[PDB]
Design a protein around this ligand. Structure first.
Ligand SMILES: Nc1ncnc2c1ncn2[C@@H]1O[C@H](COP(=O)(O)OP(=O)(O)NP(=O)(O)O)[C@@H](O)[C@H]1O
Ligand SMILES: [Mg+2]
Ligand SMILES: [Zn+2]
Lengths: 96, 533, 299, 188, 55, 161
């Protein structure tokens, strides 16, 4: 029954966060974040909206999707890179 | 007995009289077909229904019996409009009745006209059926003949001219035959119930309907649905088909010629290649040369001179996809290959056989490799022959053959193997936040200069029209430069296999202008672009 | 001729299913209505898979027996008004058409044939080209264009029906004391109602439904649709009417009411259409205009 | 200067124009006999001296001009009847090389009168439209036999219509010219 | 042209162990997993002609 | 349904209800719930398409509840395959352990529909499914000092997709 959609207001913030994550990834010499991750973030936000039968995605859905994907991306890295990432990414992995 | 004559008379009067406005459309079609030696007629159901609904009712009730009567009526008209000898004409039908999904056909539909659609998945070779056939009687040596027609027969046993229980044999020396073909139709992919593999049917066609389709094409079919012999009292179903549905102009090359005389064309083509990728000017220039290529040549002593170009790239994932889209022919692969053939080829096993990888399959076109470092051990040695000779040769387990490998290779990775390429470059990056934001905004838009097709057609046109030659000035320039670099290196390597690469680049640059001769203008940019390092 | 939507084109089943009268008589917007139609064809002795065949190709026997089958069966469904007489024309071998079908083809061609002031001018200019796209179809030499008109008519009625069900099932009709109000704030594609004729077709659907749903309260009705480019509501005022089978005529009084509120009002409005029962107003001004309208004694 | 498609031939429009200058018989529905017509390419007396329902002869273009309105009715030519067309088809079948002696404008005039004057025939028009077709088909067979005698010198034709000649003109003349060039080149 | 009566809730059950010769021509109720299925074919109904589906 | 969805914290309660017999591992339960609900598929005939299915991979130390949650999903989900992708059409596909098999999965992750040819015959099939997989990290124990590639037997695009 449920087929959610995005809201066009906060997507500017998502683009800024995507660019920031890419800049930080390059700055520490990590393998870069990609468009596949951004697509996955939007898809997971849709799934979170579907879970409560909401036809709208919301800011908290995007926040939770961002946390899931960012944490998953962090877990793949080497230990020194992992520490730099979590120190910088604190405003996404824990805060928003 | 009389009914066979009244029905034939009726369809004969149909063809002679059906006007819509002022043209006798079936008389005209039947005449125009004979002039090009096409013996058939394409009738439309709606016109037959409009003319007289009773005829359509008879046809709809008993199609196996009535289709032959209408075919012989066509022959009787064909003689009047063209003779003051002809075979029997084929009737073909068009219809707009409701399509039946292939999965719903059942016992209610046997010997009914059915309209359906699907995908052709297989095609048989042609085979011969008899129409007029001659007979010899073994005992008395009397002779006679029979006329077959292909609707749902065996040799007779009423002996003539006692004459015996089964005395008839065929004179193949005085008999007439037609073509027949078999096909397989599979139900539409977007119809199948979930979790099930698609159902399919088998079907037959003859004469002008043969050799009209190829595997993998979607089609619509009109035909009689029927059964044949091949549990208890049970038979296989099939369909008899009655109808099927499925270089440059002057104004094109005028645009290509206008492009050819533009003073900044080289810049325009470079700008048009992967426009989202920032920077990397010389990479784009090298891809233009790889797409355009040099000129092939053949000498009086039979030696053969290569035309292709080869480039290596050390972001980079996007360019190979772009090259795959713009090129007239293209193949894309990762270093491990699509099978145990790898990139080049291998022998496999039970008797042995051989299969080629993605060097043989791209013959005549372009091939791009996505991680050249993931090349397998056999391919590491075999690519030397594939690139230098444009061939692959094998003599293993009794196999002894040579394969063609005429292609231009684009490759990327992250040693001595670099010597195989004409140019090598390392991809470079820049980190402007506006670029990422623009990409992200476009991604959200889909989630919520020259174009590719025109450029591909232009590249095709240039490859077909021009193959330019070095002017003498270019020869003096190149030879002087060659000895200069070798002398400089000697007092401090360049080799003939690289001079012959610079020549190919020079020719490819002259090719954009469609200039029949290459000039010092091109030589300068060729050596300028040769700075791979 | 039968008050069935384009009988001699599409299929017998579609002829009943999209008929404007049948929807009011059997309530086809819900499954308890649709099952009545299946039940009818089962009792009439017509196999349901043949009722859906294209009417040209439907079997000859059913075609000639249909005129008697209706006399035995429509009474049980209260549906006897389907039967009537009309005019039919045919030319050579190309098949019959009735006047009732012809006018639907012409109206379809008028509707769908192919800062703010400039956009309004472009729209009103496009609507004038369709006059000639309909004029050239009154010629027997150009039947090709008439067939296109029929193909467009079927899609228009389909899209109308798919909006009517949404209006009724979500109960968007607001039952004020003096008149009935309905406003479309969103839809699958709301652009189709920007043309007056399409809006009137939707209104005529809803009016039959309201006329048969209860015996009581024949009321005026107001119907409106928003446009995202102008931010204006296109509004139409519609009368009731008595059932087909039943004595002076009634009169549409929204003209004087809209004129008087227009003469009084602060609101940004337009009145330039030949039919004065249709008006236009900006987004924020709809509610004060309707408030002043319902406060008025002119309704 | 002149268009490329008019260098050697007449278009069908010019053929219609040529045919339109012929006379035809009419019944007028008004009397003009006591302004006056004062034409300069035809007789003027006939139009000035018309009497209602009295048969008279005028050029075809004026006849069609009158028949556009109520003021006139056109008499069909006598060859354009079922009996005569039956006899001509029988002649065509009987003599397998000769062409039957139909008038030089038969196709053009038939396809003008069937459009402008469908109401003034005596025979049913749906039969005439069939017999005209039969004649054209038989004549086309006879034409296709004749194109095997193109030669270096000449050809004879008889009773072939103007439109039928004009249809074939650019083929016959071109192939015949090239045969002439090939032959004379060997003499020289 | 013809209607088939389907029986439901027959009050006794066997697996494929308990069937014996005494059950022949009697009505039975059975349970299991469908291991293999043929395609659908037409079959001649009477031995003018009529057919029915079979599997 | 609408009553419980109107209450606060319904997301957390759904995750809590996921795989009751298994203690801890809340993130795994979160990911599995997200895969079972999934997104929406979209397409733009101008050059792009986006799947609705969500694919998940879990690297498991020996005995850390992986096979039990796959069995739980198999009983929970509407349609599924456990190890054949035709049977997983519009369903969930489950893999508990792991060249041609990997090759088939390579094609399956790149596409949403499968195509094959044999002896001149050509035909197509649909995959259209969410993939849940689990694996043992290159022997007895994972090494946290190293990136993921060192601990798996997978090509790089798998970890991308
Ligand atoms: N809450 C729990 N946490 C961990 N293990 C549990 C828990 N509850 C039961 N177990 C048991 O621990 C194992 C769970 O991990 P599981 O992956 O199913 O075992 P396994 O398949 O034998 N290990 P592996 O072969 O590497 O997948 C089973 O033997 C369970 O019976
Ligand atoms: Mg386990
Ligand atoms: Zn004998």
């Amino acid at each position: 029954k449920i087929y959610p959609k995005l809201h066009q207001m906060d997507m500017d913030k998502v683009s800024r966060v995507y660019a920031d994550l890419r800049r930080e990834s390059i700055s520490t010499g990590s393998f870069p974040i990609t468009v596949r991750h951004l697509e996955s973030i939007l898809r997971i936000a849709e799934s979170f909206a579907k879970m409560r039968l909401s036809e709208f995605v919301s800011s908290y859905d995007l926040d939770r999707a961002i946390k899931v994907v960012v944490d998953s991306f962090v877990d793949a890295q080497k230990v020194s890179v992992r520490r730099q990432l979590r120190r910088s990414f604190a405003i996404y992995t824990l805060g928003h | 007995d009389d009914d066979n004559t009244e029905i034939i008379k009726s369809f004969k009067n149909f063809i002679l009289e059906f006007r819509l406005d002022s043209q006798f459309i079936y008389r005209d079609q039947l005449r125009n077909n004979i002039l090009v030696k096409n013996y058939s007629l394409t009738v439309n159901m709606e016109h037959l229904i409009g003319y007289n609904e009773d005829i359509y009712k008879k046809l709809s009730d008993e199609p196996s019996d009535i289709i032959p009567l209408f075919e012989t009526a066509i022959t009787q008209v064909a003689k009047r409009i063209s003779i003051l000898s002809l075979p029997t004409f084929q009737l073909i039908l068009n219809s707009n009745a409701n399509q039946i999904p292939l999965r719903d056909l059942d016992s209610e539909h046997v010997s009914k006209i059915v309209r359906l659609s699907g995908i052709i998945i297989s095609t048989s070779v042609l085979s011969s059926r008899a129409t007029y056939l001659s007979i010899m009687c073994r005992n008395c040596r009397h002779t006679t003949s029979i006329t077959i027609n292909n609707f749902n027969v065996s040799l007779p046993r009423s002996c003539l001219s006692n004459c015996g229980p089964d005395p008839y044999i065929i004179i193949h020396e005085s008999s007439k035959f037609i073509d027949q073909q078999f096909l397989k139709l599979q139900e539409i992919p977007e119809l199948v119930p979930v979790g099930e593999m698609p159902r399919n049917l088998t079907m037959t066609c003859d004469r002008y309907l043969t050799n009209k389709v190829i595997p993998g094409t979607r089609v619509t079919i009109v035909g009689i649905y029927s059964i044949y012999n091949s549990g208890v009292a049970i038979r296989t179903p099939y369909i008899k088909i009655l109808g099927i549905q499925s270089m440059f102009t002057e104004e094109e090359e005028e645009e290509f010629l206008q492009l050819s005389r533009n003073p900044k064309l080289y810049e325009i083509l470079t700008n048009s290649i992967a426009p989202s990728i920032f920077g990397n000017e010389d990479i784009k220039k090298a891809i233009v040369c790889l797409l355009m290529g040099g000129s092939k040549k053949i000498l009086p002593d039979g030696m053969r001179l290569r035309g292709d170009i080869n480039v290596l790239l050390l972001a980079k994932s996007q360019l190979l996809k772009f090259v795959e889209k713009v090129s007239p022919i293209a193949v894309y692969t990762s270093g491990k290959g699509s099978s145990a053939a790898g990139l080049t080829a291998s022998v496999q096993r039970r008797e042995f056989y051989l299969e080629g990888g993605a060097m043989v399959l791209a013959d005549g076109g372009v091939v791009c490799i996505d991680e050249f470092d993931k090349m397998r051990d056999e391919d590491r040695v075999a690519i030397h022959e594939a690139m230098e000779q444009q061939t692959i040769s094998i003599a293993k387990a009794g196999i002894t053959t040579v394969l063609n490998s005429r292609t231009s290779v684009l490759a990327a990775a992250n040693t001595t193997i670099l010597s195989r390429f004409d140019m090598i470059f390392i991809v470079k990056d820049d980190h402007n936040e506006e670029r990422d934001i623009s990409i992200a905004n476009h991604v959200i838009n889909i989630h919520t200069e020259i174009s590719i097709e025109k450029m591909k057609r232009y590249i095709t046109y240039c490859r077909l029209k021009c193959a330019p030659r070095l002017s003498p000035q270019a020869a003096e320039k190149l030879s002087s430069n060659f000895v200069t670099i070798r002398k400089q290196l000697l007092i401090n390597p360049i080799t003939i296999r690289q001079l012959e690469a610079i020549i190919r680049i020079t020719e490819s640059l002259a090719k954009l202008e469609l200039s029949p001769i290459a000039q010092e203008r091109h030589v300068d940019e060729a050596i300028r672009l040769f700075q791979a390092s | 001729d039968y008050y069935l939507f384009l009988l001699r084109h599409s299929s017998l089943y579609d002829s009943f299913y999209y008929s404007n009268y049948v929807n009011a008589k059997l309530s086809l917007w819900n499954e308890n209505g649709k099952k009545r139609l299946h039940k009818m064809f089962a009792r009439m002795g017509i196999p349901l898979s043949t009722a859906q065949e294209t009417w040209l190709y439907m079997d000859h026997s059913i075609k000639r027996e249909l005129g008697i089958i209706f006399d035995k069966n429509l009474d049980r469904y209260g549906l006897q008004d389907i039967i009537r007489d009309g005019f039919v024309r045919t030319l050579g071998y190309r098949g019959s058409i009735s006047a009732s079908e012809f006018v639907e083809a012409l109206t379809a061609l008028l509707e769908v044939g192919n800062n703010s002031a400039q956009k309004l001018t472009n729209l009103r200019k496009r609507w004038v080209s369709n006059f000639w796209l309909s004029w050239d179809a009154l010629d027997d030499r150009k039947v090709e264009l008439l067939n296109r008109g029929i193909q467009l008519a079927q899609d228009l009625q389909r899209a109308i029906f798919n909006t009517g069900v949404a209006i009724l099932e979500k109960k968007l009709i607001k039952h004020l004391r003096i008149y009935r109000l309905c406003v479309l704030q969103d839809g699958p594609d709301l652009d189709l109602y920007r043309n007056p004729l399409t809006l009137l077709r939707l209104g005529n659907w809803l009016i039959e439904c309201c006329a048969e749903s209860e015996d009581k309260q024949l009321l005026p009705m107001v119907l409106a649709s928003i446009d995202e480019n102008t931010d204006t509501y296109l509004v139409a005022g519609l009368t009731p009417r008595y059932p087909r089978g039943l004595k002076k005529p009634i009169l549409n009084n929204f003209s004087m009411a809209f004129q008087q509120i227009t003469a009084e009002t602060d609101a940004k409005v337009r009145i330039d259409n030949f039919e004065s029962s249709i008006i236009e107003i900006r987004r924020e001004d709809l509610s004060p205009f309707l408030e002043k309208l319902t406060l008025s004694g002119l309704l | 200067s002149l268009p490329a498609h008019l260098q050697q031939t007449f278009s069908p429009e010019e053929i219609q124009f040529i045919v339109e200058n012929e006379p035809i018989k009419i019944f007028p529905r008004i009397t003009t006999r006591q302004t006056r017509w004062q034409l300069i390419t035809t007789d003027d007396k006939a139009l000035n001296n018309m009497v209602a329902m009295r048969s008279t002869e005028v050029v075809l273009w004026i006849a069609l001009l009158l028949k556009q309105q109520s003021k006139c009715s056109i008499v069909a030519p006598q060859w354009l009847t079922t009996k005569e067309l039956d006899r001509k088809i029988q002649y065509e079948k009987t003599h397998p090389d000769r062409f039957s002696e139909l008038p030089w404008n038969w196709l053009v005039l038939a396809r003008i009168l069937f459009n402008k004057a469908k109401d003034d025939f005596h025979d049913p028009i749906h039969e005439l439209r069939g017999k005209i077709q039969d004649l054209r088909e038989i004549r086309q067979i006879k034409v296709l036999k004749g194109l095997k005698y193109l030669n270096e010198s000449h050809l004879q034709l008889d009773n072939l219509s103007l439109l039928e000649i004009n249809e074939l003109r650019p083929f016959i003349t071109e192939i015949m010219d090239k045969l002439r060039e090939i032959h004379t080149a060997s003499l020289t | 042209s013809e209607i088939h009566v389907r029986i439901s809730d027959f009050p006794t059950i066997y697996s494929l162990r308990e069937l014996r010769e005494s059950n022949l021509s009697s009505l039975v109720r059975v349970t299991g997993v469908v291991t293999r299925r043929t395609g659908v074919f037409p079959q001649l109904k009477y031995v003018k002609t009529v057919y029915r589906n079979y599997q | 349904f609408r009553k419980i969805s109107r209450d606060r914290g319904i997301i957390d309660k759904i995750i809590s209800s996921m795989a009751p017999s298994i203690y801890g591992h809340r993130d795994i339960k979160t990911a599995v719930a997200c895969s079972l609900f999934g997104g929406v598929p979209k397409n733009v005939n101008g050059k792009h398409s986006i799947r609705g299915d969500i694919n998940v991979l879990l690297l498991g130390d020996p005995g850390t509840a992986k096979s039990q949650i796959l069995k739980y999903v198999e009983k929970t989900a509407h349609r599924a395959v456990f190890a054949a992708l035709v049977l997983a059409d519009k369903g969930v596909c489950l893999i508990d352990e792991f060249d041609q098999d990997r090759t088939s999965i390579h094609e399956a992750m790149e596409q949403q529909s499968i195509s094959i040819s044999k002896a001149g015959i050509v035909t197509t099939l649909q995959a259209r499914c969410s993939i849940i997989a689990a694996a043992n990290p290159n022997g007895g124990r994972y090494n946290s000092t190293l990136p993921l590639a060192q601990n798996v037997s997978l090509t790089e695009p798998i970890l991308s997709r």
